[PDB]
Amino acid sequence: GIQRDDNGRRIWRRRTLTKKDDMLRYKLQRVPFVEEQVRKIKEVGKVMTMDIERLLLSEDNRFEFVNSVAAEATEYVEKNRDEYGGTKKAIFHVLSNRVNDLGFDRPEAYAESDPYKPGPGYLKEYYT
Amino acid sequence: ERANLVFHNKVIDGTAIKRLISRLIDHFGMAYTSHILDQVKTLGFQQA
Amino acid sequence: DGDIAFVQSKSFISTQGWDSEMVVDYRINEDEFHKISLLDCDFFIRKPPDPDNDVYDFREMYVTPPDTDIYSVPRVLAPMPQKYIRCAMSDYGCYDVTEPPIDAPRDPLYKSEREISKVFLTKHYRNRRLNDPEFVLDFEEIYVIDSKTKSITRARVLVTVPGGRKRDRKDDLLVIRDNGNSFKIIHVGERDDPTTVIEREEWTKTREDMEKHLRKLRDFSVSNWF
Amino acid sequence: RILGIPWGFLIGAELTIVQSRISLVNKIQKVYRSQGVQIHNRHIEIIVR
Amino acid sequence: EILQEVMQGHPVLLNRAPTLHRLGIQSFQPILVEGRTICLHPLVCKGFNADFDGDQMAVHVPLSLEAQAEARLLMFSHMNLLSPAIGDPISVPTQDMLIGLYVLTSGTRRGICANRYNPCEPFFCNSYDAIGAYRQKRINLDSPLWLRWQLDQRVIASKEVPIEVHYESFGNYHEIYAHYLIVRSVKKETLYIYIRTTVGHISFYREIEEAIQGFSQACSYDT
Amino acid sequence: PFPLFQSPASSSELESADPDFYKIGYVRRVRAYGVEFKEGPDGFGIYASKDIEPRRRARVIMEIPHELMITIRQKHPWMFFPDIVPIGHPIFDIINSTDPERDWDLRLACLLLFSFDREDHFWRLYGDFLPAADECSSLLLATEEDLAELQDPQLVSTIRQQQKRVLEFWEKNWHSGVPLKIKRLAEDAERFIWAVSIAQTRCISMKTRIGALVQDLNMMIPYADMLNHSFEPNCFLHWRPKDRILEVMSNAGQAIKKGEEMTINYMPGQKNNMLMERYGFSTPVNPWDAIPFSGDSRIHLNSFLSVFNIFGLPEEYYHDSELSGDDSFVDGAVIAAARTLPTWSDIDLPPIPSAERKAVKELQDECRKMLAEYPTTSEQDQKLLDSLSEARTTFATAVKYRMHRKMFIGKIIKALDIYQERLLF
Amino acid sequence: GTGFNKGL
Amino acid sequence: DAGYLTRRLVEVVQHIVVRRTDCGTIRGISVSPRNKSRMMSERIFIQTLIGRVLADDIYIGSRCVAFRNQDLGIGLVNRFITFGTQSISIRTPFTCRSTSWICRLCYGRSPTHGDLVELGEAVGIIAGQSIGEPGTQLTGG
Amino acid sequence: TRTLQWKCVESRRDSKRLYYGRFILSPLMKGQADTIGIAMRRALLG
Ligand SMILES: Nc1ncnc2c1ncn2[C@@H]1O[C@H](CSCC[C@H](N)C(=O)O)[C@@H](O)[C@H]1O
Ligand SMILES: [Zn+2]
């Protein structure tokens, strides 16, 4: 059990994977060309879609989850009436908070600006 | 992390793609498959 | 030449000249035997001690269903050697890549497993070791372990390399074909491209299928192929 | 008439009910399966129930 | 500008007046678009049976915060992909979406359709080079090619013994299968795999793999 | 203050674990958030990689998929989830021929050995990170030399009773007539002892809902057993049924500082003898360790509870930190004293300080006797451990168990001392 | 659905 | 005609809602795979047992392979076929101890969500639409 | 009001053999951006 050398320090067997794992070499690689996809997903809003499902994974009844979200969203707007009207939505703020409560990081209410917007009067036309 | 898909090599058709969507939903969930459908939709439209 | 040291053990019980479809009451020590795992059966060949597990003793062999203790006697169909030889063991089979049903979460989308139908034991030339600089495989002596029949035989090998038994073994190229039944030795310079091998087999198959499809037309007898 | 008062109607009606249940679902599924329509038995058993 | 930010995050319900399924009414995130017509996703137009010879939908905006909650969390298309009738997908690609995928996976011409006479191809170290060569018009979509496979055996082919095994006298033996080449050795355990496929199969496989990785990176729970 | 001017470039016993340890799990959809695995002479352990800022609800720390675990029902019939035993396999007959309530560890040991034999099972890889026969601290592996030094006739008798039960089970089910698929699982009697030791020291019983079925499973979760034990844990185990993921969640509203160890309570409340019997370790701060005492002398526990800022019902005894300010003395050890010490209390009857002072010395007069009963002192044992350099780890644990018990007696001696004088104010 | 019980 | 049939179908079961977890019934519809294959395909026989909640334990010798109130997946169903068991009793809407509602276990696993159905689901209306929707989808001798 | 200017908005180097870069060109009149993007893509690839 306990083993020490002359200096008095403790020497222990470094537990290491003796055998070899096939899947280890087949899964550590990452694709290099998803920069446009990840940017599109965030801009579209599918990042919340995964978060919405993730919350439902730890839930027992999806009808109770939406009632709890609606109840908490109503609580948010009552406290701060002049915050959840435009770029920030009461429901999205609840969802962002509930994800942040799990220990992950999301922007507040999933709100995103347009860094490339030229002027105040220029609104982004959508290419249908 | 590399995804452990299956390299479909012969052909895919209406029945083959329908099975693949079913397996993707049952393995990755609807949020992943919803994004996969959009990529598949773009790929099918582009190559058509 | 280069005969391996013909040592003798204490548990050696020769199974030569025994009935095939009969079991042996006793149980063998797996440490003393080569364990060959195939799809339908597990094959045991006596393993004489050696620095590398290359020496085979075909004097006593046993076949059992996969992962089972009831040993039997394989259906020997060839004059197996009575001396220790070094054989290179290479399996022969197919990959059964299947898509299992998904019920539990995160179940694998595919299940890739390799099924072994035959195992080839290629004798080293003059029983030379792998580490020997003059190592070369003697393709004349090849033994096939068939899982379906639970039998072991000797490969019927056709040598087409000019030079006879005195040829240079370094230019040999064994060409296994027809479900591991046709063994042909050709010069390495005559190796077919893998693309050619695939296209050649596809051309033969589709040509026969096309002819059968066209055979039902009533002007087939007065038509040409092109 | 074979069984008594508390069980002549108890299991007699149950036999009619149970036999009708399997018969009804088979006939309904016969139409949809013939036309290549896949519907789970749950959606039909609820109607039959 | 106020309208653009107002609709942001506020789902609306799209209803087909000749309603057909449970998907006849569904919720989408509206985006302000040009013109005077309602653009709709091609996939959801099959759930609505929305033919494009003429159709008009009724759109309703939930007002109460409870209604907006359940519109976003219960009626969105990303959470209703399986038909309750049997549990089968509803947003399956159809029409020219299915045609394009079929053409991609319609691989090489085989046998007598590929060679005029009885015989009696490029090697790509990775899928990126195969795609890149296709972009540079070096190879066609259906032209056969060999892909150096670094993963495990993954392609779905009929379970058959190798067509031909080229067993060299030095211990290296190549196993030519109907769809891939495997280079094993006796001295070593290299296990080199080369897949005989097309750009189309690679493009289809890469599209699925990139979609998964792109979705995973965007939803970076690791950080 | 620029980064170039700033030049940033202890705990030597703890080294970062093998990266393959997390990698072999990471490929199997195992995610650890904000934590890292460190190993040392004591063993493995999970330590925070960053400050865990508290949130409204519990924060997810680790996730383990169901397919990576070994699970067996606590109640007959014995059904294995992520089913690994094939139908008709002889190992099921061995498992099914066990005591329904006493041989839970044996049934897990058979599965543990069976899993190591399976080539596709994940535990054949994770088994390399399990402690060996010498590294494991379970008392089931200890010999008479460590058991005699343990100095506990009740605990030694129980341990030696288990050793006979485990060894005889191996003899019955691993004779010469077993199939090779069973014989190779336990080639020698010693290995099966190690298998039971791992099963006892790493089983995590929990009520989990798998699909539509709810049951109690003697689980063998990997990466979650590595969490050490503490009666005041900073995290707990939560089973998520929808995706069959076992979540390790830090307590809600609790901050975890950088480098702090993440711990869970293996048992809700138990004495050190139970922990030694099951897990082979003891804690001097156990709030459930007892000691026989004569009922003739007793004190007013309400005064005793308040003087150390202990509040709540006896089922929920705990200490308040900010009220005490610093109070480095008070810990979980003195909380056990509030239960095991003979006490008296009326509705609101104040105590007599002189009578308690008459009894505190009388109480402490007895307290010196138990320490005299053990020939060695508390500091003598720990001094021996530092001087010791070649011995089995079970010997060290046996030293620790009697050392912790002696300190538990030593702790209450000081506890009564400070309590007696503080009663005046 | 969401109206089951009384939302609590 | 199909649209008219939808209204009648939804009306008869408009009140059916999943309101209880387990109704506590003990009776279960027994299905055997050996007396059935003579008439219908085996593939559809799997679908009848997919998403069902088992009403009684299933044994293969002394080995227990499934338990009461355990959901049936393709893995369990295929096991029954391979080993040729016949005493398979499952919970169905026929076996629920109610007619104004249905419990989660008696109904089974929701096809849409791939898990046990959640309380409050308007499962009756879903059943009505699941039959009426294919309404607009319904020689050589 | 503005002049036609370009800028690099994103630049990543997550390898020694994989560089990423995103560039913006603005303002552009209607129909010009597609022409520039198509021709630049052809020049970049071959
Ligand atoms: N709080 C604690 N104090 C001391 N040892 C502990 C402990 N919690 C766990 N252990 C040790 O761990 C065993 C239980 S299994 C826990 C995994 C182990 N800590 C490891 O590093 O691999 C106990 O038998 C004991 O030896
Ligand atoms: Zn019921």
- DSSP secondary structure letters along E104-125: HH-----GGGT-SS-----EES
- Nearest atom, ligand 1, residue F44 CA: 21
* Residues within 6 Å of ligand 1 by CB: F 43-45, 137-138, 201-202, 225-226, 228-230, 279-281, 283
Taking CA F63 as the corner, what is the angle to CA F59 and CA F66, rounded to the nearest 5 degrees? 145
Best CA proximity match to F233, nearest among F216, F217, F248, F218: F248
User: How far, in Å, is the centroid of ligand 2 from the Cα of A30?
Assistant: 49
For F391, list phi and psi in degrees, rounded to 5: -165, 165
Those residues whose beta carbon sits under 5 angstroms from the ion ligand 2 are: H 23, 96, 103, 106
F279, F385, F393: residue to mutate for ligand 1 pocket, most atoms within 8 A of CB: F279
User: How far, in Å, is the centroid of ligand 1 from the Cα of F374?
Assistant: 26
Cβ E167 vs Cβ C176: under 8 Å: yes
Residues of E in contact with A110 (CB under 8 A): 9
Q: Which ligand places an atom closest to the C-alpha of F281?
A: 1
Cβ F235 vs Cβ F227: under 8 Å: yes
Chain F positions touching chain C (beta carbons under 8 Å): 29, 65-67, 82, 179-181, 243-244
Residue D17 sits at the chain H interface (C-beta within 8 Å)? no
Within 13 Å and on the Cβ side, how many CA atoms surround E59? 14
Best CA proximity match to E51, nearest among E16, E82, E89: E16
Cβ neighbours, 10 Å, residue F295:
7
d(CA H119, CA H58): 27
Inspect the interface and report whether the beta carbons of H134 and E83 lie closer than 8 Å.
no
d(CA H107, CA D40): 12
Inspect the interface and report whether the beta carbons of F61 and A28 lie closer than 8 Å.
no
User: Which residues between 150 and 179 in chain C have a beta carbon less than 8 angstroms from any beta carbon of chain B?
Assistant: none
User: How far, in Å, is the centroid of ligand 2 from the Cα of H114?
Assistant: 19
Best CA proximity match to H10, nearest among H127, H96, H140: H127
Rg (CA), chain B: 11
Name the residue with tokens 């509870």. Answer: F305
Q: Is the dihedral of CA A93, A95, A101, A104 positive or negative?
A: negative
d(CA F384, CA H133): 81
CA–CA distances in Å: residue E67 to residues A71, E92, F295, H126: 11, 29, 66, 21
Q: Which residue of G has its CA nearest to E67?
A: G2
Give the distance, in angstroms, between the CA of residue E205 and the centroid of all CA atoms in the same chain: 7
Which residue's alpha carbon is at the smallest distance from atom 16 of ligand 1? F226
**Which pair of tokens denotes residue E144?**
């056969």
d(CA E62, CA E40): 19
Q: Is E142 annotated as a binding residue?
A: no
Residue H52 sits at the chain F interface (C-beta within 8 Å)? no
Best CA proximity match to E110, nearest among C215, C211, C201: C201
Name the residue with tokens 């299940």. Answer: C111
Give the distance, in angstroms, between the CA of residue F381 and the centroid of all CA atoms in the same chain: 22
User: How far, in Å, is the centroid of ligand 2 from the Cα of A64?
Assistant: 22
Cβ neighbours, 10 Å, residue F168:
11
Best CA proximity match to F282, nearest among F219, F338, F336, F203: F336
CA–CA distances in Å: residue F292 to residues F295, F304, F372, F415, H119: 9, 19, 15, 17, 53
Residues of H in contact with G4 (CB under 8 A): 17, 19, 119-120
Cβ B6 vs Cβ C97: under 8 Å: yes
d(CA E73, CA A52): 7
d(CA E14, CA E77): 11
d(CA C105, CA H114): 10
Cβ neighbours, 10 Å, residue I11:
10
Amino acid H39 reads M
Rg (CA), chain A: 24
F13, F219, F229: residue to mutate for ligand 1 pocket, most atoms within 8 A of CB: F229
* Secondary structure percentages of chain E, helix, strand, coil, to 5: 30, 20, 50
CA–CA distances in Å: residue C41 to residues C83, F4, F84: 25, 69, 22
Contacts of E75 (CB under 8 A, 6+ apart): E11, E13, E25, E26, E27
Inspect the interface and report whether the beta carbons of A102 and F243 lie closer than 8 Å.
no
Amino acid F138 reads S
**Which pair of tokens denotes residue E113?**
């359709």
- Nearest atom, ligand 1, residue F228 CA: 8
Residue H84 sits at the chain E interface (C-beta within 8 Å)? no
Cβ A1 vs Cβ F135: under 8 Å: yes
In this structure, the strands spanning E172-176 and E164-168 are antiparallel
Residue B15 sits at the chain E interface (C-beta within 8 Å)? no
d(CA F189, CA F193): 7
Cβ C183 vs Cβ E165: under 8 Å: no
Cβ neighbours, 10 Å, residue C179:
13
Contacts of F387 (CB under 8 A, 6+ apart): none
User: How far, in Å, is the centroid of ligand 1 from the Cα of F276?
Assistant: 11
- Nearest atom, ligand 1, residue F226 CA: 17
Residues in chain C: 226
Q: Calculate how close chain B gets to A29, using CA atoms only, in Å.
A: 6
Residues of E in contact with B44 (CB under 8 A): 93, 96-101
Best CA proximity match to A37, nearest among E145, F69, E215, I10: E215
**Which pair of tokens denotes residue C213?**
């499809």
d(CA H57, CA H76): 12
d(CA F37, CA F45): 6
d(CA I22, CA I8): 6
Taking one residue from B and the other from C, the number of pairs with CB-CB distance under 8 angstroms is 19
Give the distance, in angstroms, between the CA of residue C207 and the centroid of all CA atoms in the same chain: 30
Residue F374 sits at the chain E interface (C-beta within 8 Å)? no
d(CA E83, CA A54): 22
F44, F228, F263, F273: residue to mutate for ligand 1 pocket, most atoms within 8 A of CB: F228
Q: Is E55 annotated as a binding residue?
A: yes
Inspect the interface and report whether the beta carbons of F389 and A8 lie closer than 8 Å.
yes
d(CA E33, CA E117): 58
Best CA proximity match to C71, nearest among C4, C23, C109: C23
Residue I3 sits at the chain A interface (C-beta within 8 Å)? no
- Nearest atom, ligand 1, residue F283 CA: 3
Give the distance, in angstroms, between the CA of residue F109 and the centroid of all CA atoms in the same chain: 19
Resolution limit, Å: 3.0
- Nearest atom, ligand 1, residue F202 CA: 15
User: How far, in Å, is the centroid of ligand 2 from the Cα of F267?
Assistant: 37
Which residue's alpha carbon is at the smallest distance from atom 10 of ligand 1? F228
- Nearest atom, ligand 1, residue F393 CA: 26
d(CA C64, CA C27): 11
Cβ E105 vs Cβ C198: under 8 Å: no
**Which pair of tokens denotes residue A73?**
């969203």
Residues of H in contact with C111 (CB under 8 A): none
Cβ F339 vs Cβ F317: under 8 Å: yes
Which residue's alpha carbon is at the smallest distance from atom 1 of ligand 1? F229
Test mutation, E1, E3, E6, E8, chain A, max A CBs within 10 A: E8
Q: Is E88 annotated as a binding residue?
A: no
Test mutation, C99, C103, C106, C107, chain H, max H CBs within 10 A: C103
Out of E120, E146, E153, closest to residue C95 by CB: E153
Give the distance, in angstroms, between the CA of residue F79 and the centroid of all CA atoms in the same chain: 27
Residues of H in contact with D39 (CB under 8 A): 130-131, 134
Best CA proximity match to E174, nearest among E157, E158, E191: E191
CA–CA distances in Å: residue F295 to residues F104, F271, I4: 38, 21, 94
E strand map for A36-123? none
Inspect the interface and report whether the beta carbons of C104 and F243 lie closer than 8 Å.
no
User: How far, in Å, is the centroid of ligand 1 from the Cα of F228?
Assistant: 5
Residues of E in contact with C206 (CB under 8 A): 110-113
The overall longest dimension of chain I from CA atoms, in Å, is 41
CA–CA distances in Å: residue D18 to residues A121, C156, D22, D40: 72, 67, 7, 19
- Preceding omega of F77 cis (within 30 degrees of 0): yes
Helix or strand holding residue F31 (H, E): strand F31-32
What was the experiment behind these coordinates?
Answer: cryo-EM
Grouping H, G, I as helix, E, B as strand and the rest as coil, residue C205 is helix
Q: Calculate how close chain A gets to G3, using CA atoms only, in Å.
A: 8
Inspect the interface and report whether the beta carbons of F56 and A3 lie closer than 8 Å.
no
Cβ F218 vs Cβ F72: under 8 Å: yes
